[PDB]
């Protein structure tokens, strides 16, 4: 009694001298004392001094068992001398961050600790060996480890550290706001709030993120990991694992003690719950016991949920440096791997070495501690269950383990139904892409119903396949909602029936419920652990074998010594691409003097590229030596271009000299290319840029080499794909004698001939052996081989649109079917909470059978009302998918052709691809988990208010706080993930190059510059991944504060009303409140996935509203059938426009055409003739005037009763992939004997009759498996299949030979001589045989008469005819 009271004295010194000392530490303002061995070894005497109170504290809790109760303030002292230790070992770490060499407060604090211990020390030592023997060994052997360590800390406290030598300000813009943050505003992540608020009001941009602290930069993590790798390589067993284990494994032990002292801190709270329950069952205990056990119960869950949010802050940051020091030691390897290794792989398979690999190393970081933590708090969380419910928790753990197989078999059965839904979805999207590509022709044959039905036919299969792939989410909401009940049910059923006298009471039931909740989380997240450890040790082997490749940098060329006058000197060398292959170049004796233009020529493949590769060092030199001196400019055969701007490629790491840059552009014949390029020159080139022509690319490479102005110019025939005139001009102004590169050494490798006469010097290779080395005439006269060779949020309207699509008579059957299961769960819990209040003295308390039955058959009802609601939600999700996709199709199909002209077919397809996939198979389970987690946080919070009603008064501000933190978090964590997505891609797009073009980089000795560029591209990703690691901690602090104020109040209001409560409903109210923060984290995760995934359904509903003209059939205004060959198609003041709001394309046009007569439409380009083929077909709806067919107003018919009476031969020949039968009659109303006859008229009969498939011939993606003329014969065959009375031919003589043209015009003349044939053309010779010709000019009719009369009229057609 007289020692515990004394133990408080130092522990009350810190907590009163802290606020008057921390404020002092706001007066140095720059300390940063360096972490030496006297500090990191000093703040670890804190953690052990804490683990020696925990071991002492839980010995008191072992007094509840065995009945022997310690003193009331005898388990409190270990819990206050175990928080000042977590405050000592934190003032040590925070004083170091300031400039406090001698602590002052901490030294006298340790002095107090030792002095306050001496009196208890001198209270047992005189009674230890004098009295006798051990005498309670635990407290006697624990009081010294809190004296040995306190004396060690006192010794290490009165020391003095080195001077701080704090740095300068060193940063003008906004820095990381953790450096220079308070002690409270750093424990609670309060420094992020300034961004969160900001992120709510404005859109975050890369200009707002935080500059990295210096030790986190991209170049200072790869530099430390490189040194470890090199030190490992010196060991002459090169393994990579221990290199980064010795690199980061010291910031991974700082995160393995937070995890420890948070795993140990989470088992206190069940024990305090047991104390509280035992207290309420006793009516004589003073209330301040209850208030003290309800106060500790919150200040022990507010530092178990604070140490955990700081373990995550250090293991996520150490994971952003696993994959930053690895994406930089690979990129530093990609620049030195020999070319054999590069050619024995794929450029895109090494990109995957950090795109796919080396990025799951940041996923394995969080899980790398569950390797020792998850076992630790199973083995421990069972030990506490065992002393509560005895061996009857073998079943409650066996079931929760057995739940891993029967929940991992429903993650590989959800891959059999997840690939079958990917092949089918990709077939559907391929059909959709084929429709969107050619929609013009598919709109104007009135084939819309056929292809629409064909798309619905294979959407039906996908929906039917989701009818069985969404009944495996019924089995993922079971083990999440009905497992917490079923473990309790199995445990209690075994417990009450393994022994008749196992009385079930309040503590046994509810503290063990709490321990089951603890045991749950580390137990269901072993599957992910094994998944990662097995799929991220495959990655490590790939990275290890890549880094253990062969680097070719053996100084293969001496850049120092040459006999004066020569630039290149090869001395009998031999070269091969790889040692296994036979040598490619043998015994080369080459003496290229300075400034000389040497042309290296020979038979095609005689060793031309190999010579340049050897001179650059790319070839493995088997024997010999090469001495080349000077800066080398290299022009590769296949030009390599950065994903950058044409000025930066041509600059290529040189200072912009505009006087010289213009000269290089003019000499390399690039000033011409600066005109027709979109942006001029600053346009991007490459994959995100514009595909330049091959000649343009190789001239860009030549310009890069020329502007580099190096000493030597190695050339690999850059003018292969360049026109002769351009090639000769380039040779004159750049390469040849009069060119700029006159005083510089040159080397030429070529297949050509015309450059040899202008050459200064020529070397002839002979199968890897130099044959002749002489000038052009000397070699020519010898008759050698040379002679022979010559952003906001979503409104309620979106959710109501989704609910209406699902069916608001099925949205009800879900939102009042979780209410039923919520009520059944509350009822089962209340029934248990009345079973634990057994008849405290009565023999007839033998209704264990009844009490167990009305609990089993009432938690089961809570099962059959979540499967019956998960199934209803799955059915509603697939119904919404079907309805929304049906609307999307039936709208975009009927959309006017103007919408397709405006919008590119790429923006259309993503909606059918990525805005429906989200609607189809990620919204259904996100809704389901948001409903799972909302009806767990509501039952939990209405079983508390039902027991202690006063508690309700605190739920109004703890809901304002929770919704406020969600509104502020989701509005920022949404922008940081978008902002991270747009910056993760450039790293890989930059690693794509520097692998393909590492030879060019090395040639301009430009490897350091590219390392710098990769560092600043990894660092821009890293500036946006450091937030979103802290917006998730500033959230989990504002959610584990709401979830721990509920813990405080559910106990405070249960001690306040202790006279009406009983040991039962308080155990429920309290133990069922510890996991109110596990359902508030899930309801924050899902409420923000949902808020972002649901913009897509309002996009799908936005694009389903675009205006359309959709009278396919009127069925009430049907024109008379049996259409006659009257052909009396007459315009009447007709006027049309492509775009609503533009000028009149055809103004006041008027004509009358009799049946069968041939009328031709000709004119200048842009006269609107094309749109004329679109005005009879009502593609562009009649604006002014009208159009009449046989005296009938066309504007009064269903569109598919208009277009199904007119036939054309459309401009673009489109063949939709499938059988050739489909491409001739999609509606399938044509007999097969007529089809073949049409193929004889089409003159395509020979092809189809010869082919084995015949009527089932397969077609590729739009007529690339068929020649052009075959495509036009297919169109003509469609025409003969239709054979209406009106035909509108469309200019089919543009890019085909005459023979096909002969066939098509002959068939038109013969077969359709009984039809009204309208024809448009630019080739008048096609229409010279037509009876009458119509000529349009400026959208108004000018001449309309016979070809002879129009020629006789001396008109525009007469002038146009002379032009042909």
UniProtKB/Swiss-Prot annotation:
Secretion signal span: none
One of its GO biological process terms is:
transmembrane transport
The glycosylation sites annotated in the UniProt record are 846-847
* Keywords on record: ATP-binding, Cell membrane, Glycoprotein, Lipid transport, Membrane, Nucleotide-binding, Phosphoprotein, Repeat, Translocase, Transmembrane, Transmembrane helix, Transport
Keyword Glycosyltransferase: yes or no? no
What sort of enzyme, by top EC class, is this? translocase
Q: Which residues form the ABC transmembrane type-1 domain?
A: 252-535, 811-1092
PROSITE patterns in the cross-refs: ABC_TM1F, ABC_TRANSPORTER_1, ABC_TRANSPORTER_2
Q: In which tissues is it expressed?
A: Mainly expressed in the liver. Also expressed in small intestine, colon, prostate, testis, brain and at a lower level in the kidney. In testis, localized to peritubular myoid cells, Leydig cells, along the basal membrane of Sertoli cells and moderately in the adluminal compartment of the seminiferous tubules.
**What does the entry list under GO cellular component?**
basal plasma membrane; basolateral plasma membrane; ciliary basal body; membrane; plasma membrane
Q: Which reaction does it catalyse?
A: taurocholate(in) + ATP + H2O = taurocholate(out) + ADP + phosphate + H(+); glycocholate(in) + ATP + H2O = glycocholate(out) + ADP + phosphate + H(+); taurolithocholate 3-sulfate(in) + ATP + H2O = taurolithocholate 3-sulfate(out) + ADP + phosphate + H(+); taurochenodeoxycholate 3-sulfate(in) + ATP + H2O = taurochenodeoxycholate 3-sulfate(out) + ADP + phosphate + H(+)
**Principal location listed in the UniProt entry:** membrane
Please indicate the ranges of residues that lie on the Cytoplasmic side.
Answer: 23-42, 90-101, 162-243, 312-367, 413-474, 539-803, 883-925, 969-1039, 1084-1364
Q: Name one GO molecular function term.
A: ATPase-coupled inorganic anion transmembrane transporter activity
Positions bound to ATP 1: 602-609
Q: Kindly list the places in or outside the cell where this protein is found, as annotated in its UniProt entry.
A: Basolateral cell membrane; Basal cell membrane
Bilayer-crossing residues are: 2-22, 43-63, 69-89, 102-122, 141-161, 244-264, 291-311, 368-388, 392-412, 475-495, 518-538, 804-824, 862-882, 926-946, 948-968, 1040-1060, 1063-1083
Please state the Enzyme Commission number of this protein. 7.6.2.-, 7.6.2.2, 7.6.2.3
Query: Which residues of the sequence carry a binding annotation for ATP 2?
Result: 1163-1170
Q: Which residue numbers delimit the ABC transporter domain?
A: 570-790, 1131-1363
Q: Which residues are on the Extracellular side of the membrane? A: 64-68, 123-140, 265-290, 389-391, 496-517, 825-861, 947, 1061-1062
Bilayer topology annotation: Multi-pass membrane protein
Query: What this chain does, per the record?
Result: ATP-dependent transporter of the ATP-binding cassette (ABC) family that binds and hydrolyzes ATP to enable active transport of various substrates including many drugs, toxicants and endogenous compound across cell membranes. Transports glucuronide conjugates such as bilirubin diglucuronide, estradiol-17-beta-o-glucuronide and GSH conjugates such as leukotriene C4 (LTC4). Transports also various bile salts (taurocholate, glycocholate, taurochenodeoxycholate-3-sulfate, taurolithocholate- 3-sulfate).
PANTHER family noted in UniProt: ATP-BINDING CASSETTE SUB-FAMILY C (PTHR24223), ATP-BINDING CASSETTE SUB-FAMILY C MEMBER 3 (PTHR24223:SF405)
Spell out the protein name for this chain.
ATP-binding cassette sub-family C member 3
